Each structure stands twice: as structure tokens, then as C-alpha cells.
Design a protein around this ligand. Structure first.
Ligand SMILES: *[C@@H]1O[C@H](CO)[C@@H](O[C@@H]2O[C@H](CO)[C@@H](O[C@@H]3O[C@H](CO)[C@@H](O)[C@H](O[C@H]4O[C@H](CO)[C@@H](O)[C@H](O)[C@@H]4O)[C@@H]3O)[C@H](O)[C@H]2NC(C)=O)[C@H](O)[C@H]1NC(C)=O
Lengths: 49, 114
């Protein structure tokens, strides 16, 4: 099926790659460390007028 | 760390006034209510006076009204109690109080923490 026929002659033939290999997905990123100061504005004792 | 330190107490004579101070550390002062409580020997506890962040609301007990005055300054980070015409009932262990809701009372969340 890589020569696209049903009869092949004597000799050596250089075929292709038709086998299918399953794959996964992965992702990596640095360490989240420097958070924003949301507590000071959302958890303040007194809010301005 | 949160501490409240009281100073200025001592022994006085009738007709003589004194100055109490409440210096504290470890928390921001400009948004908290502060109050005074005294502890005389073996008669429970009773309230003296209080203050809030804006100091617009100031209250005294009627038994002690007219001869105390509470004051506070942010720059010096301390609470002040002014006495006038000290009498016999004044003999007690005075406590300095901080609130948790920047106001005197009435709100759902209020309480004496330190
Ligand atoms: C403003 O302040 C309030 C109150 O301080 C805050 O709400 C609190 O957030 C914390 C965030 O951790 C909550 O704590 C969690 O509580 C649940 C149960 O309610 C627990 O299951 C959680 O346990 C996990 O995390 C632990 C580490 O803390 C792990 O050891 C554990 O194994 C679990 O993985 C966790 O303790 C807390 O319940 C709330 N409280 C209220 C009343 O909502 C709010 O987030 C602050 N707002 C801002 C914007 O910061």
C-alpha cells in the first residue's frame, strides 16, 4: 500500500512509517510565589466613604 | 505582637488630679475603638469611658460623668485619660481596652480582645 499496488517484484523496497503512536500532553511552569495584596483591600476593617 | 501598657497611676490626695496613659504596640491604631475599665478589689468589673477611630463618639458612665475626659493622639500612639476632682470611689485597678470593630457598640461584631 505504499507502492499503491497489489503485486511487488523481487528486490528491496524503502517503505514509509504508517504505524501510529499515541501521545500525551504536558506543561510546566515556575513557582508561583509573589502573590498580590488582595486581603488588605478586600478584608479591611473600615472602608472609606 | 499586640500589647497594651498602662502608666501614670499612683497614690493621690483628695482634690488632686492625675494623668493616665495607655501606650500600645503591635497593631495599627487609627482604626480601632479603645476603652477604659477599672478593677476595684472584689466588686466585679465596671466600665469607665471609651473612644473610637474618629473620636466623634465619646461616652461616659453617669456615675463618673462630668469629671473624666478621654483623649487620644495618633502621632504619640497612646490613649489618655484625664481625671478631675479625684474621690474615694476612684480607687481601682485601671485597665486599657481595645475593640475589634473601630466603634463603641451596636454592631453585630464587637468584643474586647486585648
Ligand atoms: C478574608 O478573611 C476570611 C477569614 O479570615 C477568609 O476566609 C477564609 O479563607 C480561608 C482560606 O484558607 C478558609 O480556610 C479554609 O477553610 C476550609 C473550611 O471552610 C478548609 O477546608 C480549608 O482547609 C484547606 O486548607 C488548609 C490550609 O489552610 C489545609 O491544611 C487543608 O488540608 C485544606 O486543604 C481552609 O482551612 C476559611 O474557611 C475562610 N473563612 C471564611 C469565614 O470564609 C477570606 O478568604 C479572606 N478574603 C481574602 C480576599 O483574602
Amino acid at each position: 500500500c505504499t507502492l499503491k499496488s497489489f503485486t511487488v517484484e523481487k528486490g528491496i523496497y524503502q517503505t514509509s512509517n504508517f504505524r501510529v503512536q499515541p501521545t500525551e500532553s504536558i506543561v510546566r511552569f515556575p513557582n508561583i510565589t509573589n502573590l498580590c495584596p488582595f486581603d488588605e483591600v478586600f478584608n479591611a476593617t473600615r472602608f472609606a466613604s | 505582637e499586640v500589647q497594651l501598657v498602662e502608666s501614670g497611676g499612683g497614690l493621690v490626695q483628695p482634690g488632686r488630679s492625675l494623668r493616665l496613659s495607655c501606650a500600645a504596640s503591635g497593631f495599627r491604631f487609627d482604626d480601632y475603638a479603645l476603652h477604659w475599665v477599672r478593677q476595684a478589689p472584689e466588686k466585679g468589673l465596671e466600665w469607665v469611658s471609651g473612644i473610637s477611630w474618629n473620636s466623634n463618639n465619646i461616652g461616659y458612665a453617669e456615675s463618673v460623668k462630668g469629671r473624666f475626659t478621654i483623649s487620644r493622639d495618633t502621632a504619640k500612639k497612646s490613649l489618655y485619660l484625664q481625671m478631675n476632682d479625684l474621690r474615694a470611689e476612684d480607687t481601682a485597678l485601671y485597665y486599657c481596652v481595645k475593640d475589634r470593630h473601630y466603634d463603641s457598640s451596636g454592631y453585630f461584631v464587637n468584643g474586647f480582645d486585648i
